[PDB]
Amino acid sequence: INKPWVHSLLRICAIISVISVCMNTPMTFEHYPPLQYVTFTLDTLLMFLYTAEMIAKMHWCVFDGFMVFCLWVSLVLQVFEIADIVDQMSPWGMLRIPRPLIMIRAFRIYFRFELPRTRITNILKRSGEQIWSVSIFLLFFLLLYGILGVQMFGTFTYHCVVNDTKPGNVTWNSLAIPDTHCSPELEEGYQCPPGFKCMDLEDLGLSRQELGYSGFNEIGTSIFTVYEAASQEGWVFLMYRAIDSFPRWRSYFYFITLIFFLAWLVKNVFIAVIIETFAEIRVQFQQM
C-alpha cells in the first residue's frame, strides 16, 4: 500500500478484472471450454490481493468495500456454477452486474483533485441544474406531441389483406406485397385495389407484440413513438404509414413540425449548454 508500485499493480489488476468480466459468458465457455477454468483462477487470485487492502485499511472506502464484496459474490457464484448444480444459463449472472464498474478505479488517480474542489463542484452543480431544465423542456414537448398524436393519428392497425382471409388464419400469405395500411373512409387514406380489402388485424386476434409496439394507442406509447421519431430513426416510414392511414395534411404538418422543433433546436440546446460550461472552465480555472 505504501509503494506506488502497489498502486500500479492494483490498476493493472482492475484492468484484468474488467477483461475477465467481459470474457465470462456461457457461449464463451461453450465454444472454448478450457477458458472456463482460466477465468476462475484470476477471479480468485485477484480477489486475494484486494483482501489484503481490506485487512490493511483498518488502520470513499465504502466504494472499495462494495467492489470487493461483489468480487466475493462473483467467486461464490462461480464456485456453485462450476460444480454443475446451477444451470449456466440461469439468471444468477446478474450478481456480476456491478463488477465491471471496477474500471473506474483505473482512472482514480486522474480523478483525484487537490486544487480547490469547491469550484469544480459548483460548475458540476450548475451544469446539473441546466441539464435538468432542458430535460423538463424536452419532456414537456414530448408530452405535447404525444397527446397530439393520440388525438390525431389514432392507431396504425388497419391493413389490406386478401379478400377471403378469415379470423385466426392470418399469415404471411394473407398480406399484400408490400404491407400497406388504409383509412376505412371512402375518400380519405389509401383504398385497397380490387380483389383485396383492409380491416383491423387486432380484431382478427393478433397480439400487440407481433404487430409492433410503435403506434399512438395510448399516451405512453404515443410519447414513446414521438421520442423514436425525434431520434430521426424510422420517422419517414411512420410518416408514410400516417399518410396511407389518415389525411395527408395531418401527417405532413405534424411530422414537419416535429422534425423542425425536436430534432434540430432542442438538441442544439445541449451543445449550447456544454459550450457555456467550456467557457466557464476557460475562465474559472484560468489555466488548462
Binding site: V18, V21, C22, M23, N24, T25, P26, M27, T28, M89, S90, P91, G93, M94, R96, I97, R99, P100, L101, M103, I104, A106, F107, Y110, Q209, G212, Y213, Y227, E228, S231, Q232, E233, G234, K267, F270, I271, V273, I274, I275, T277, F278, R282, V283, M288
Partner: protein
C-alpha cells in the same frame, strides 16, 4: 521523397480486381512494395547514421516514420502480405501532410492540445466497455437473443446505439427476447443510455473542438489591445 510516396500509394491503390482466373502471392505489385520498403529502409539507415539514434528519435515525426518503416518491413514477409499490417502500408500517405505548411498549421490549431481529445477518447472507450460488459451480464443468458450472446456482439450493439443506426430495431429485438413483465425496465435503461450518449457525449466532442478553435484568452487580450481594381488595365 514526397513524389515517391505519392507514386507508392497510387500504385498500391491501383491493385484493382481483374479476375479470379489469375491471381498469385507473387506479382508486380508485390515486387514494387518490396522495392519501396527497401528504399524506406535505406532512408532510415541513412537518417540514423547521420543524425544518430538519439537525435533521430528526439522528434515525434521521426519516431512515427521509424514505426511505419518497421511495420512495412514486417508487412513484406510473404506469409504476412495483405495482413492487418497493410494499414502501415497506407499510413505512408500521412507524410503528404508535410507538403503544405498551411495544412500542418491548421491541423495543429484545430486539434489543439492533445490532452483534451485524448482524455475524451479514453473516456468514451472506457464508458463503452463498461456499459457493454454490464448489458452483457444482464442479457447474455437470455434465450433467443443473439445480440448479447458474447461480449463482441454486445460491443457491436452498443456502438450501433451510439451511431443511432437501427437502434430502434435492436431495442425492439431486446424487448421481444425478454418477457413483457421486464420490457419496461430494459426499455428505460436503453432509452437513458441512448439519451446520455447522443445528447452529452457528442455535444462534448463539439464543445472540445470548438474550444480548440477558440483563441487563448491571454492571446485574445494581447491582440485586441495591440489592435487598383478591374480597371487597372
Amino acid at each position: 521523397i514526397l513524389s515517391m510516396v505519392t507514386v507508392d500509394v497510387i500504385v498500391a491503390a491501383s491493385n484493382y480486381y481483374k479476375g479470379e482466373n489469375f491471381r498469385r502471392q507473387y506479382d508486380e505489385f508485390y515486387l514494387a512494395e518490396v522495392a519501396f520498403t527497401v528504399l524506406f529502409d535505406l532512408e532510415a539507415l541513412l537518417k540514423i547514421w547521420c543524425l544518430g539514434f538519439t537525435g533521430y528519435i528526439s522528434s515525434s515525426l521521426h519516431k512515427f516514420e521509424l514505426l511505419l518503416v518497421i511495420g512495412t518491413t514486417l508487412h513484406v514477409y510473404p506469409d504476412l502480405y495483405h495482413s492487418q499490417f497493410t494499414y502501415f502500408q497506407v499510413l505512408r500517405v500521412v507524410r503528404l501532410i508535410k507538403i503544405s505548411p498551411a495544412l500542418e498549421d491548421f491541423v495543429y490549431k484545430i486539434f489543439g492540445p492533445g490532452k483534451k481529445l485524448g482524455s475524451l477518447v479514453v473516456f468514451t472507450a472506457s464508458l463503452l466497455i463498461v456499459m457493454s460488459a454490464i448489458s452483457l451480464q444482464m442479457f447474455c443468458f437470455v434465450e433467443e437473443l443473439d445480440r448479447f450472446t458474447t461480449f463482441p456482439r454486445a460491443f457491436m450493439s452498443m456502438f450501433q446505439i451510439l451511431t443511432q443506426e437501427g437502434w430502434v430495431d435492436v431495442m425492439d429485438q431486446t424487448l421481444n427476447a425478454v418477457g413483457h413483465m421486464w420490457a419496461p425496465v430494459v426499455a428505460i435503461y436503453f432509452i437513458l443510455y441512448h439519451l446520455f450518449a447522443t445528447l452529452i457525449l457528442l455535444s462534448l466532442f463539439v464543445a472540445v473542438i470548438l474550444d480548440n478553435l477558440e483563441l487563448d484568452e491571454d492571446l485574445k487580450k494581447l491582440k485586441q489591445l495591440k489592435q487598383p481594381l478591374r480597371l487597372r488595365i
